[PDB]
Amino acid sequence: MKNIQVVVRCRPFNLAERKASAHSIVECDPVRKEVSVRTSSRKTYTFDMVFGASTKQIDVYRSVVCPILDEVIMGYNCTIFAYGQTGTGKTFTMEGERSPNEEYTWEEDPLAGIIPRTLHQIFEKLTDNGTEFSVKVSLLEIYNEELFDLLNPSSDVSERLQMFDDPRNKRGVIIKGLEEITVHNKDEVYQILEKGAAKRTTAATLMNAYSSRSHSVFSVTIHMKETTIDGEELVKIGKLNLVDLAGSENNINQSLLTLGRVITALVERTPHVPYRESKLTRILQDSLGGRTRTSIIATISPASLNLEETLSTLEYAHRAKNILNKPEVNQ
Numbered sequence: 001m002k003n004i005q006v007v008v009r010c011r012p013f014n015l016a017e018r019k020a021s022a023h024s025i026v027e028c029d030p031v032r033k034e035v036s037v038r039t040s041s042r043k044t045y046t047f048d049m050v051f052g053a054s055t056k057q058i059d060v061y062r063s064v065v066c067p068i069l070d071e072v073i074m075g076y077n078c079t080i081f082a083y084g085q086t087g088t089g090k091t092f093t094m095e096g097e098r099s100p101n102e103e104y105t106w107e108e109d110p111l112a113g114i115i116p117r118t119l120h121q122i123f124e125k126l127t128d129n130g131t132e133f134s135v136k137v138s139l140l141e142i143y144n145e146e147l148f149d150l151l152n153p154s155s156d157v158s159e160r161l162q163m164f165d166d167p168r169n170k171r172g173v174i175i176k177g178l179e180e181i182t183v184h185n186k187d188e189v190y191q192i193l194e195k196g197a198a199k200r201t202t203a204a205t206l207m208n209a210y211s212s213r214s215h216s217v218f219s220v221t222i223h224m225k226e227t228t229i230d231g232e233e234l235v236k237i238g239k240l241n242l243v244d245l246a247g248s249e250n251n252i253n254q255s256l257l258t259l260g261r262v263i264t265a266l267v268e269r270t271p272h273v274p275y276r277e278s279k280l281t282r283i284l285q286d287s288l289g290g291r292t293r294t295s296i297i298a299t300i301s302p303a304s305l306n307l308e309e310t311l312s313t314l315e316y317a318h319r320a321k322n323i324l325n326k327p328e329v330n331q
């Protein structure tokens, strides 16, 4: 029925990265939707949208997320995930950072990313849309095939969760004891994201290379009740997953390895797709050849130092455009 959207976002050169040449190794064409990489010998790859080095946070949100957020409110499950080498901007893009000195409020911090922006807009868009709705969110991170709850307000972070097949959902799982915090309004948001960021920091003291190796699944489930002209009970449920994947360069890497075998299985149209053999592919089975509306943001470097992963990343992301999903709304 419908193709997975792939986008590419390149970041500006960082402090480590030397640029020798007068003209770029990575050129992004937003109009032609082409990323062109100098291996005058090139490989040019077309994507669904492309975002060069100076693309700001608000544009990414505007171009990619605003459209998807509308599908969430109709009650499609969506899933945006970020993919690419450590240091290209998967966390910058999906979470963002906090500007120093309290120069800006969270709502207006231009370093803010998809997660906080989205949560903010869910409340603006639904408050003046007439709907009866609630928002409850959760923050699960996978590391070494273990499940960490960063929003559980009480528990020690190293208390890890179990997963089991949802007896109500053919291609889904329930994460037992996962803290699903109800957000009653936008002013409850920051406090929740802070607690998430803090617990995360604690988990990093416990495990090696945690930032780069962890997958981070930040869900948000919109319950929307609506009365019909016929006097019925229209209860629709949007779910948006916002997934920050472990760095592409990596049992520690079982989930990332399996994500590859799944995508491979799907594109080459081989009958057995091994969702079941990793926690990530179990949690997101429905985002990959299922009934969810997936977008991948593939984050690349502009620089010669990281060309090899920049290109690995582009080939991996580009074959992912051939996956067909059959979106369905939850009532």
Ligand SMILES: COc1ccc(C(SC[C@H](N)C(=O)O)(c2ccccc2)c2ccccc2)cc1
Binding pocket: 091, 092, 094, 095, 096, 097, 098, 099, 106, 107, 109, 111, 112, 113, 115, 116, 139, 190, 193, 194, 196, 197, 218
């Ligand atoms: C789980 O999703 C999150 C968590 C934390 C943040 C975030 S950015 C966190 C940063 N991505 C990180 O991993 O440390 C925040 C930072 C510090 C305190 C509280 C929040 C932020 C929120 C709104 C605006 C700007 C920055 C953003 C998204």
Ligand SMILES: Nc1ncnc2c1ncn2[C@@H]1O[C@H](COP(=O)(O)OP(=O)(O)O)[C@@H](O)[C@H]1O
Binding pocket: 010, 011, 012, 014, 085, 086, 087, 088, 089, 090, 091, 092, 093, 097, 212, 247, 299
């Ligand atoms: N699009 C961007 N604009 C400005 N700075 C960026 C951008 N993407 C990444 N950076 C910076 O480069 C570093 C890498 O970001 P990070 O989100 O940790 O990457 P990842 O999560 O992909 O390992 C951070 O310091 C970040 O602020």
Ligand SMILES: [Mg+2]
Binding pocket: 090, 091, 092, 211, 212
């Ligand atoms: Mg990161």
Ligand code: NA
Binding pocket: none
């Ligand atoms: Na264990």
